[PDB]
DNA sequence: TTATCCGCTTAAGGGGATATTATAAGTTTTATCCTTTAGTGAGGATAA
DNA sequence: TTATCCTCACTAAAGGATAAAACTTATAATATCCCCTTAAGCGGATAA
């Protein structure tokens, strides 16, 4: 499937936006599906540096994926 | 490592590892030049922590975060 | 009943009790399972007697011992 | 908050004193030194009082600065 | 579809450093072990 | 009735020390705290 190492929010957001794109999902439907505003999703994607982890583990849900750490 | 689904557990994993390596909050708060009271609030109240500090902390422990299903 | 401060004063004391109550050392002994002789030493020579026995014959004269300041 | 019931066993009496000893902040060693006996003896008293001798009992009762009486 | 935008309530991060704790030591306070002698205390029992 | 002896298995207590456990400091380490400046995210929602 697809795993690479992410080391930064500007690197990590890239991949997530790619996932949503690929499954052809629109921001408007992830937001009205997890309970956050469309804006939230857009600000996240273009402004990853300062977003709350609740949002980040909340979007993974939307994208139907999870995460693990590794050395 | 197992799978992480919420900020809280995400902080336990990184905590659990910080202890295993016998590292202290102070010796790792200077390796990334960050506030000692930040690594603290992080482990206890990670829910609203910035993703920048998160990654500065992650690389502090010499590991790397990864997406999956 | 005044305060006692020696194994002797403590013995004369309890004996005077056994005496006034028509009891004998040979009978007091039966009821609490101790050698009649043992009671004879308790009164005549209490210094090396044993607290157990001490509270065996005590509870035998159906009495108790409370501390005092 | 300050009063004593009636002691019926050799343990009850033993622990009753171990309590007065501590409530006064006295170590088994200074009491022992006072009355010329070993601390090793004060020790076995609060622990294994069944076989202890009255001599010792009144020796500690005294140093602890107490006395006793008989009850009905 | 999505990057943008005023108002408005709630909070992390960089500063600077301290209440607050969980650990190492550091010793007190107790409990135990050795050897010997001596006296219970239980069996059984008998003077006076 | 009660004080005493005789044999025996058992241990207090005292002399001489010391393991093992309870409380006290050291002292590093994790959580808190005040103040500023700053961005988040929800609301209703609109330009591109």
UniProtKB/Swiss-Prot annotation, chain D:
Domain HTH cro/C1-type: 17-71
Gene giving rise to this polypeptide: hipB
GO BP terms, alphabetized: DNA-templated transcription; negative regulation of DNA-templated transcription; regulation of DNA-templated transcription; regulation of growth
DNA-binding region, residue intervals: 21-47
Described function: Antitoxin component of a type II toxin-antitoxin (TA) system. Neutralizes the toxic effect of cognate toxin HipA. Also neutralizes the toxic effect of non-cognate toxin YjjJ. Binds to operator sites with the consensus sequence 5-'TATCCN(8)GGATA-3' to repress the hipBA operon promoter; binding of HipB(2) to DNA induces a 70 degree bend. This forces HipA dimerization, which blocks HipA's active site and thus its toxic action. May play a role in biofilm formation.
Knockout mutant characteristics: Cannot be disrupted, suggesting it is a functional antitoxin; no visible phenotype when the hipBA operon is deleted. A hipA or a hipB-hipA operon deletion show decreased biofilm production in the absence of antibiotics.
Description of post-translational modifications: Degraded by Lon protease in vivo; half-life is 17 minutes in wild-type cells and over 200 minutes in a lon deletion strain. In vitro degradation by Lon is Mg(2+)-ATP-dependent.
Notes on how activity is controlled: Degraded by Lon protease; degradation is inhibited in a HipA-HipB complex and when bound to the operator consensus sequence dsDNA.
Keyword Methyltransferase in record: no
Top-rank taxon: Bacteria
Record's keyword annotation contains DNA-binding: yes
Name of the featured protein: Antitoxin HipB
Subunit and partners: Homodimer. Binds operator DNA sites in the absence of HipA, inducing a 70 degree bend in consecutive operators and deforming DNA between the operators so that HipB dimers bind on opposite faces of the DNA. Forms a HipA(2)HipB(2) heterotetramer which can interact with a single operator site on DNA, inducing a 70 degree bend. When 2 operators are present each HipB dimer contacts 1 HipA molecule, which are brought together by the DNA bend and dimerize, blocking the HipA active site and inactivating its toxic activity.
Swiss-Prot/TrEMBL keywords: DNA-binding, Repressor, Toxin-antitoxin system, Transcription, Transcription regulation
GO CC terms: protein-DNA complex; toxin-antitoxin complex
A Gene Ontology molecular function term of the record: DNA-binding transcription repressor activity
């Amino acid at each position: 499937m697809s795993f690479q190492k992410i080391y930064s929010p500007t690197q990590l957001a890239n991949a997530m936006k790619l996932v949503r794109q690929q499954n052809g999902w629109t921001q408007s439907e992830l937001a009205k599906k997890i309970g956050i505003k469309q804006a939230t999703i857009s600000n996240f994607e273009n402004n990853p540096d300062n977003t709350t982890l609740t949002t980040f583990f909340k979007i993974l849900q939307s994208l139907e994926l999870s995460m693990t750490l590794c050395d």
